[PDB]
Amino acid sequence: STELTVQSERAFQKQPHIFNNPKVKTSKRTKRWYKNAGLGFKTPKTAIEGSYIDKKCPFTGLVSIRGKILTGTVVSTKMHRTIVIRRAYLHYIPKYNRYEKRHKNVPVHVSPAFRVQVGDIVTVGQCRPISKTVRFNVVKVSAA
Amino acid sequence: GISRDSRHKRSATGAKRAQFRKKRKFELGRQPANTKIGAKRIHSVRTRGGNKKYRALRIETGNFSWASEGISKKTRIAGVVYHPSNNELVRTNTLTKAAIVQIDATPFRQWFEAHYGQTLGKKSKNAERKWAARAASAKIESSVESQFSAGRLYACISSRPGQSGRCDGYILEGEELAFYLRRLTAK
Amino acid sequence: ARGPKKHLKRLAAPHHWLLDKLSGCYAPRPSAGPHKLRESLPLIVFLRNRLKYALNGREVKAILMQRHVKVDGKVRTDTTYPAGFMDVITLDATNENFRLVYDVKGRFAVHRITDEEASYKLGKVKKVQLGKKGVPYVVTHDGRTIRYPDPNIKVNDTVKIDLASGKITDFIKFDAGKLVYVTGGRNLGRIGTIVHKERHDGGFDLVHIKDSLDNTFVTRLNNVFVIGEQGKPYISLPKGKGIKLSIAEERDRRRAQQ
Amino acid sequence: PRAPRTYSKTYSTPKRPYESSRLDAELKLAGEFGLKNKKEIYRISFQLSKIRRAARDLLTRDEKDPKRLFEGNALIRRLVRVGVLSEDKKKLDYVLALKVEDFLERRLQTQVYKLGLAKSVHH
RNA sequence: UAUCUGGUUGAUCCUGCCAGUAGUCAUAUGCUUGUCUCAAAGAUUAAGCCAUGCAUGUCUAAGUAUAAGCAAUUUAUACAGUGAAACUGCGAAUGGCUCAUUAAAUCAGUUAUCGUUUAUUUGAUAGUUCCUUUACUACAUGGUAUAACUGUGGUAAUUCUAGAGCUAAUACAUGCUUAAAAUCUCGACCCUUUGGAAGAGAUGUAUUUAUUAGAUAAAAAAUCAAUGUCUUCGGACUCUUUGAUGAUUCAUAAUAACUUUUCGAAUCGCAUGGCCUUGUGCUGGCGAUGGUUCAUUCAAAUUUCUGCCCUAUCAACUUUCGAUGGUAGGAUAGUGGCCUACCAUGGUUUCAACGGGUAACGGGGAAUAAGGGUUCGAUUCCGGAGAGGGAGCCUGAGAAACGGCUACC
RNA sequence: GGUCGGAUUUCCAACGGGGCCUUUCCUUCUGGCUAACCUUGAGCUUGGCGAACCAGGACUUUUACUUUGAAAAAAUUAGAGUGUUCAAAGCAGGCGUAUUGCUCGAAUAUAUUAGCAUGGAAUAAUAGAAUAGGACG
RNA sequence: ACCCACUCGGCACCUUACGAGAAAUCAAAGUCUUUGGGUUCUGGGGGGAGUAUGGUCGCAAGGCUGAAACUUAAAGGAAUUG
RNA sequence: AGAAUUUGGACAAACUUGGUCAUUUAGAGGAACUAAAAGUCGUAACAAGGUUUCCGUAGGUGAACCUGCGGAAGGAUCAUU
RNA sequence: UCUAAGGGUCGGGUACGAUCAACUU
RNA sequence: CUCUUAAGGUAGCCAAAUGCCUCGUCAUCUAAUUAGUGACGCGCAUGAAUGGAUUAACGAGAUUCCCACUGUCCCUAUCUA
């Protein structure tokens, strides 16, 4: 995670329509909006108590998780906020009455609320197209 | 013309896809507005399913809002001072979203005197009754107070001039103002 | 392609219309209306193919243009006006009234109702949502929007429409033990007294259903139409009452009388 | 654009073109039943072949199979109806071994012959 | 109907192929052809080229008629009967044809739009618009041009048109007529402490921006900042309004403004009825057409997962100038490297990427089969693509439209 | 065969299901039905422990496989019924005092894999407490 | 160091055919139409031909990979009698 | 209100010149293969084929082929306690 | 006429600031 | 087959800077070629450290063709010291 030095881009990174009025003073100086992605997935404490913005986050962002829920093994963490998983499966050829190993590489988006290493197993929830190849968002990490 | 389809540029593996489906209209694009300042000129764009769209050019004024005070005013635009996407839009004074601009700051100044009444920068008893009740809230900030002396305010264009035909924004305050001031004062 | 289609070939029309594949190249394409194209009677099939009150499509136009036929109390001169589930058809001549219900075989059956039973209809609510100016409304399965409903009305319930004014007379709540009518799927046209339903957060609810003869089957929630409390229903069920006899038992009944 | 008219062929030629046994038995049938062709014998063999194709699929199933009970009775009923299947043989196992010319016995000219009225099968 | 036979030897048993054998909604061809039903049919080569003639036009009771059209209504001096032409409104984006392109592309099954457009149909749904809003004003209703038409004409020719003179709208372009009540801001004066006022303005919808609410597992007390509906100023205190989803910045409402400003009936047919202070006074029916927003239906666009033939004498490919991802913006009906600026070096591949080939549109299916398979699918249905090859675009809800236009070849 | 070749019961059996005990938690709280209720009122009465039905819960080892179910348009394939004179076909048709009319049908099956729900839990993998942050508390 | 008995491992050998094979023969070449312990590689009539061409390795000789046009009704294995 | 015209941009047909790939096709001459014909020369193999045959490799010779080194039995020896 | 990248020297109890100066892209 | 030698020119290459006949023959290059290149080889009189045959790079070396270029030329004119 490393908190990605939040104010680093050329534009001011903030959650839209989340206004922290300076006229009044109270606890939690910076208002943080968040939500539960549903389907039983919990919101990690990093998302609730973090400072990242990540408008593509399924908990603190503007994207919603709906559609397919998949699981895969991480094979690449070399992008920024995006990883590649490998989904293995067995394809049945009816002629020989037996299977063959196949795989697909799914690029999925990882929020700073999660920390993912190569080889870990994660579950990804479907969202609207984020990039040219990305269609899924990491929602739960099952390994470390 | 300008197309938004994807059967052009290569897939994720790097393969070049063959030609298929001569360009369709429902995947078209158009040319940018590149809105300027002064002598308002807005053209009409007929989009899909009727749905008239406004291509703003040469906008003069705008509706800028003061989030802390919850008021909006119509004020003129002086020029563009910072743009996170391209520095040329600053140099050419192009009006786009998320562009930091100066504003006249006069309508905001006159409203403050009517509402709070103390001062900015530097008669009947129905007035000071409101002013007495509307007290302890005229201590806005030291980074916004000093701008009223110069007569210009750092605003941020929250609207899409090339889509709606309007240049509407908000006055930078608090952390957002402190972020962009460091960018502007650097030399 | 390039715009909406307007022709419906035979062998591509819904199979429950019972259109002979020969004797014609096209089929009546139902117009835009309250009901889906896939589930729609429209009158030309009803008047000619079901009631034998016409010999051609020209005689159907002659009947309709004289304001004899009416759907839900309105003339509906359109020849391919889509008439769907629970729609009430009134003919001034022959003093006949009809209600569109599915036969146990999955087909729209000719059902004759009395004058009083033609003075209302049931509609499954599809969404309860706030309109403009904070006015709640309910959307039934036939596209009917009714403002100011009962606050206790929720989705998947059945309301009763007056058919003289769009007002709601009474509503049946979607609870376990209610008599239901299966609309859509392999179990189309069965009546089965809900026992329980499965939640399945994410979509595609499932409900378990067992008819009077204690035959249990499961269908998706969107195919279920509650038609009243167990026992007495709120409408006159067609002959058979949705039993779904097996083919072995069906032939013995056909062999009982001959 | 119109629904095509379904058609099918109703005869099967034998695998071997020339064998003495079949070329004799088939001609014996034609002469003794007054048939014009061999195609009129291939037709009965084809029709019987489909009968024993369905009866084998039924017998290989379990007893009291709901499909077998409905289809087995219906298949026996048709053969009993036209007289090919006798009343004493309704087990669905005598269907598989009926005969070739049991069907030829129930054709019109044979039965017209049987009740007099022709005094020869060719008449 | 789970079957084989002839051919290597002087003779034998094998391996092995050649030949025979049966079928083909597989073609072609030869000889021959009496009857009824049914029926494919310029796909293969040449998505090669086309004379000619047709294939898209359309009206009611209910948009506009002085036809200098036809006839008599005779109820009619404004019209009111039928009706050419033309303006207007729709449709022409359906259908029909073909299979050239196309190998994760199309497509099949399965998902999503909490990521968008939607003419038409069906169901609901604008009392708030005299703008210095007390003469500015027509609201028993306000203007302009023009077609058709008369006549002058030009070219060899085209569904070519010009100048002159008329006249209509559901054409174009303007435009008011209806209650209240409540609330929020300004705000005269008494003059005061507990402060209330006359009066004025604002308050539909649509657009844009910012902000607020949109809550909800459970029970009791401490004094303050000051009473907060009414006080027996001790405080009894409750009513405190709050929907849906698995999930939302959702539906919805409110505040402050913005718009060069959308919409909020100057439209048509038939019936003519009631009330009086009988005035062309006031009311009053069944429809048609149109119109803002939502829902619905007919759709569209994008989209999830799995699945495609032969090839390594194709092993590395993609990223100059877009490749993979981030931030911001522009564009779009919307999401998205769709495009742009800055940034990072990423992405696919022996589980076969990439390249080449296809005498490859893909399925539902077809032929032959004991079981397992093999071959085929231009073509009666579904989806896609194209109108000689390219590209571009107007109209419109919907077209990169070709029985539409523009340019090149 | 207690009816005249059709089914009921108390039956000696077989085969497939469910619950309980034998060391065998094979997850549950706010609350309703309190339910099957030690509930008993004189032989049908006032009061037992929540999923047998529910709204929200911390949590929740993962698959492969197999059964059942929803989906897999129509046509075509198999297949039931039926006078196209038979047949290929088609979805018709049939019965009356035929003067008024009445009425049966237009089924059913198959449809890989992928996705979805579901019971099983053998077979084949995967994980857990070892320089104990291991569980109950 | 020899002799006798047993045993594990190795090079083989003799007999027979339960079995296999077209046969020659085989204790595996058996437990294969009563057809499935795991796995790698290679062949699909005889010639043209291991030839052409393109690659790749070698200093070279050459190695590895490797066609097609064309042509043919038989080539081939083991035994039998001359 | 507004025609002809005009600035810049994007989309971008098409032409020319090259490059690259692919498919056909001419070519003096050179060198193979196949088939036919009673062609000329020899006799390399099948018997110990009259020098046993064959494999790899190298050289040589009209031609089959010969010779050296190593190897095999598909040998003409299953055999010398 | 502008824009961007490429430095030296001073500065913390036991990330940032000041100042100065290069032609290279 | 015969005469003959010390041995009778092997592998290679060739009208080559080495071929007389000769402007050899065939192909290409051109409108036309005693030029050039590619083949052929009874080669007056090629040929193996008289070194043979090749050969990347290099050359103020000999030669041929092609593109660009041009007063070399058609066909000359003009200007300056």
Ligand SMILES: [Mg+2]
């Ligand atoms: Mg079409």
Ligand SMILES: [Mg+2]
């Ligand atoms: Mg229609």
Ligand SMILES: [Mg+2]
């Ligand atoms: Mg031989």
Ligand SMILES: [Mg+2]
């Ligand atoms: Mg012989």
Ligand SMILES: [Mg+2]
């Ligand atoms: Mg053959």
Ligand SMILES: [Mg+2]
């Ligand atoms: Mg073709």
Ligand SMILES: [Mg+2]
């Ligand atoms: Mg509507």
Ligand SMILES: [Mg+2]
């Ligand atoms: Mg973006």
Ligand SMILES: [Mg+2]
């Ligand atoms: Mg981006």
Ligand SMILES: [Mg+2]
């Ligand atoms: Mg093709």
Ligand SMILES: [Mg+2]
């Ligand atoms: Mg089609």
Ligand SMILES: [Mg+2]
């Ligand atoms: Mg097209």
Ligand SMILES: [Mg+2]
């Ligand atoms: Mg053509």
Ligand SMILES: [Mg+2]
């Ligand atoms: Mg076009």
Ligand SMILES: [Mg+2]
């Ligand atoms: Mg045409």
Ligand SMILES: [Mg+2]
């Ligand atoms: Mg030993």
